[PDB]
Design a protein around this ligand. Structure first.
Ligand SMILES: *[C@@H]1O[C@H](CO)[C@@H](O)[C@H](O)[C@H]1NC(C)=O
Lengths: 49, 387, 480
């Protein structure tokens, strides 16, 4: 977090911090049909907008 | 020989002078065994008698190529299906003149049908380079849930893939819904400053209606629409500074036959050198089996590219649709229409007249914006991120 | 009321259909079916519209079952126009109204009994998973609608637990002028043992004229084609190489009187539940003339009520595209001569295959026994059907069971398999272990080779004089 404050004041950021919903870092796998290979956790959250 | 070839054309006067258009083609052709004749019938702008007013006089006349016309009602697409279905079984070609939808382009049905005018979906091809010349990397796409709209979004997304673009965001609009302001405002969260639209007459008005209270007409926005949105029942609430496209000479059905009769008349010239040149059996009742020479007749059609007539340079091939189409770039200003460019088929040719944008800004806003507020993500880890 | 006027064009026995007409034991609900038995040669479109014009105008007739024995694909397209203009549901069971179709207008309540191209794509991916042919090539020709089935291929492979060895996709042109010679040029860049081909029945002979020219079709290659290419078992183009296998729409167990009984019952009972709740029978303008004035009697709500169809213990739900999504698919293979025989069965996404492994260096039987350090066997993985990558398949006698063999000794066999080409089907020993001579007979792995049933045995075998007299041991590679 100390690193993020350094980047904030050098290229005009405005941030807000919220942790991940579950806890897992991220992994691609299929759920409930063996044919839905997709990310999860933080890695899934980034690609979801 | 007297070959009765015509069409079910509306605008009786238009088919009246078409009776002498063949005479012009009669002199040009040097063929001897064939003396094509015009036996047309009046249009039927209703579904009552199409059970008995399609082949009852055309196939019995031993037709080879059938043109088409348009009814006075602008919202109509049932006209070319009953004629196409009969020609689809017999494999005898038919020619589309006023045909404009993308339904008669997939060729999955109506195996024998030729088009002299590109369908409305083809406007997306020229649209691909339209913003690329003026930078505008980011766009927002929103179309009505229509088959033509489905084709336009399918072709463009298969056209912008060469630029390694992901089309930013795509929105879907279902025809017949009015309270759609909630859907519209979701696009405001995007950084893209390019707005495109391809909808119907009823959808164009309500979309423009929702663009008033939300100050889309304000400065910093660009709008691109098809020719179906500049004209018709959409100028009541049309936002200013629209860079919509426009078709040229496509409505001149009087000049339609000038290029229509040239290709077919000279097509038989190459055909009168092979075998199996036999007319289909007479009538529409006594013939229950198709003659062997079916789609072989078409095989001589796309090979004919004659640059003659009022428009000229017609090169129908591939999908049975015209190549190197011509459209005029149009800009709407203070409820007035002024040309600002023209697309000859390959590249864009603008006009000296100043191009305007909504809000009166002479400068062209960049089709992009930046957000200074970001949302970060972190995970509980001991030495790095205490919680 | 409701009338079911059937139409039969061709040579068929419509006399028994009268008994089938008087067999709707649906007195529980007000079906009131006035089934009509109409059958005449009316192939021309003028006859069709005129005949139905007097037919559907008799009295409130709202049902037609289409039966035909002709392969004219253009009849179905004409059928859609009548349904689009009118509001009477129409169904076909055989003939010129049983093949696929892209899409129709919302006002066309026409459905048939036959799966479409996207249904075929899933069908043969499942049976080939049983035989584990992970490497395959996709070849298709230009066709009005040749894009949907190939599109489904990419959807399945990406979200797959088991890796898929896609040997590229070929999009050669068959109807292109001056392209016949180019077919051979594009036919010299295929190496996958399995190739999937899509063509047309009329052009199948034309396509196979060049396919047989290169001649990679004798024994080591398998061709896969849709049911549309074959058409019928009796009707064969006769140029297909021996060993061709394809899926088919069931017709042997689905006879014309049998396939006509299902359609008539559903149509009458489809709107029966409508009267149960809304207490209204949908009766639009039953007039041949003034079809435009009939646009006020909309029946789209009734169209959406036909989704739930259940009869004879099977559901026959239909979608917007006019699909059945419950097809009985029977696989057919080419015999030594031109003949197609049943290969498997389909029952609620279940595939049963008569044999165990594909019959007939280049293939050599192998006999192997489990032993701790070299060959270890285990049961197959139930999650993904197969065991795992790097794990060679291993049949075990008794019937048979999909066992799986792995270890260190079997790794050697893989290395030499690519060195000198040969296929195999490893199977375990039945009587005895490692071979013993009793009453002048050999058992074990050494007993299979001496009795001419193995031709090769691998595992943990120790060389000695007695065994070296019967078989010819190779150079040893491990001290013992
Ligand atoms: C951040 O923005 C402010 C005003 O918006 C101004 O100081 C400058 O543009 C930026 N500060 C920097 C780059 O240090």
């Amino acid at each position: 977090i100390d690193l993020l404050i350094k980047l904030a004041r050098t290229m005009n950021f405005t941030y807000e911090v919220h942790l991940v919903a579950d806890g897992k870092f991220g992994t691609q796998e299929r759920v409930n049909n063996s044919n839905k290979k997709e990310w999860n956790g933080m890695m899934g959250e980034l690609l979801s907008g | 020989k007297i070959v009765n070839i015509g069409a079910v054309l509306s605008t009786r006067k238009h088919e009246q002078m078409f009776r002498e258009a063949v005479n012009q083609a009669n002199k040009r052709h040097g063929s001897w065994k064939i003396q094509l004749n015009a036996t047309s019938v009046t249009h039927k702008p209703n579904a009552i008698q199409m059970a008995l007013s399609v082949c009852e006089d055309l196939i019995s006349s031993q037709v080879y190529a059938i043109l088409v016309s348009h009814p006075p009602t602008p919202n109509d697409h049932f006209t070319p299906t009953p004629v196409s279905y009969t020609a689809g079984f017999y494999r005898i070609p038919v020619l589309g003149l006023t045909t404009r939808m993308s339904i008669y382009s997939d060729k999955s049905i109506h195996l024998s049908f030729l088009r002299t005018v590109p369908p409305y979906s083809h406007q997306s091809s020229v649209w691909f380079e339209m913003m690329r010349v003026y930078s505008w990397n980011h766009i927002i796409l929103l179309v009505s849930d229509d088959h033509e709209g489905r084709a336009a979004q399918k072709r463009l997304e298969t056209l912008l893939e060469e630029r390694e673009s992901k089309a930013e965001k795509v929105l879907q609009f279902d025809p017949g819904t009015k309270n759609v302001t909630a859907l519209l405002m979701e696009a405001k969260e995007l950084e893209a400053r390019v707005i495109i639209l391809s909808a119907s007459e009823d959808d164009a008005a309500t979309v423009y209606r929702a663009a008033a209270m939300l100050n889309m007409t304000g400065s910093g926005y660009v709008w691109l629409v098809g020719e179906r949105e500049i004209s018709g029942n959409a100028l009541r609430y049309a936002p200013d500074g629209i860079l919509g496209l426009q078709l040229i000479n496509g409505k001149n059905e009087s000049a339609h036959i000038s290029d229509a009769v040239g290709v077919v008349a000279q097509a038989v010239h190459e055909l009168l050198e092979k075998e199996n040149i036999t007319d289909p059996p007479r009538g529409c009742v006594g013939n229950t089996n198709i003659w062997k020479t079916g789609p072989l007749f078409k095989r001589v059609l796309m090979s004919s590219k004659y640059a003659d007539g009022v428009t000229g340079r017609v090169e129908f091939n591939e999908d049975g649709d015209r190549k190197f189409a011509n459209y005029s770039i149009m800009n709407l200003q203070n409820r007035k229409l002024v040309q600002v460019g023209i697309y000859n088929g390959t590249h864009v040719i603008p006009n000296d007249r100043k191009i305007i944008w909504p809000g009166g800004e002479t400068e062209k806003p960049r089709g992009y914006q930046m957000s200074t507020r970001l949302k970060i993500v972190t995970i509980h880890q001991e030495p790095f991120v205490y919680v | 009321s409701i009338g079911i006027a059937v139409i039969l064009v061709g040579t068929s026995d419509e006399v028994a259909i009268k008994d089938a007409h008087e067999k709707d034991d649906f007195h529980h609900l007000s079906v009131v079916p006035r089934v009509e038995l109409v059958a005449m040669n009316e192939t021309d479109p003028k006859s069709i519209i005129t005949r139905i014009c007097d037919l559907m105008s008799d009295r409130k007739i709202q049902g037609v079952v289409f039966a035909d024995d002709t392969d004219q694909e253009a009849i179905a397209q004409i059928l859609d126009f009548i349904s689009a203009q009118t509001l009477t549901p129409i169904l076909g069971i055989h003939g010129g109204s049983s093949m696929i179709m892209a899409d129709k207008d919302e006002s066309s309540m026409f459905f048939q009994f036959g799966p479409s191209i996207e249904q075929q794509a899933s069908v043969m991916l499942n049976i080939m998973e049983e035989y584990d042919w992970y490497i395959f090539s996709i070849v298709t020709t230009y066709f009005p609608g040749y894009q949907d089935f190939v599109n489904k291929i990419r959807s399945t492979i990406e979200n797959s637990f088991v890796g898929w060895e896609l040997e590229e996709v070929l999009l050669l042109d068959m109807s292109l002028d001056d392209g016949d010679s180019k077919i051979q040029n594009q036919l010299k860049k295929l190496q996958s043992p399995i190739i999937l081909l899509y063509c047309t029945k009329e052009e199948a002979t034309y396509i196979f004229e060049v396919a047989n020219s290169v001649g990679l079709t004798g024994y080591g290659y398998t061709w896969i084609v849709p049911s549309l290419v074959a058409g019928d078992t009796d009707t064969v183009p006769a140029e297909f190489p021996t060993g061709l296998i394809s899926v088919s729409y069931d017709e042997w167990d689905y006879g014309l009187p049998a396939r006509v009984r299902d359609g008539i019952a559903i149509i009458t009972t489809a709107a029966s539940d409508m009267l149960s709740e809304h207490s209204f029978i949908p009766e639009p303008k039953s007039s041949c003339y003034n079809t435009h004035e009939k646009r006020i009697y909309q029946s789209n709500m009734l169209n959406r009520y036909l989704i739930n169809v259940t009869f004879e213990g099977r559901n026959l739900s239909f979608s917007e595209d006019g699909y059945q999504m419950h097809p009985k698919l029977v696989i057919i293979l080419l015999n030594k001569e031109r003949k197609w025989e049943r290969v498997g069965k389909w029952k609620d996404k279940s595939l049963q295959m008569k044999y165990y492994v594909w019959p007939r260096d280049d293939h050599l039987s192998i006999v192997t026994l489990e032993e701790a350090p070299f060959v270890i066997v285990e049961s197959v993985d139930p999650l993904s059907g197969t065991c795992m990558r790097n794990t060679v398949p291993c049949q075990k006698r008794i019937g048979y069971i999909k066992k799986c063999c792995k270890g260190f000794c079997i790794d050697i066999l893989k290395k030499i398999s690519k060195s000198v080409k040969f296929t195999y089907d490893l199977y375990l020993v039945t009587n005895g272990k490692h071979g013993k001579k009793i009453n002048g007979t050999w058992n074990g792995m050494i007993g299979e080779v001496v009795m001419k049933r193995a031709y090769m045995a691998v595992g943990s075998l120790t060389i000695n004089e007695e065994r070296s007299e019967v078989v010819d041991f190779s150079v040893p590679f491990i001290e013992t």
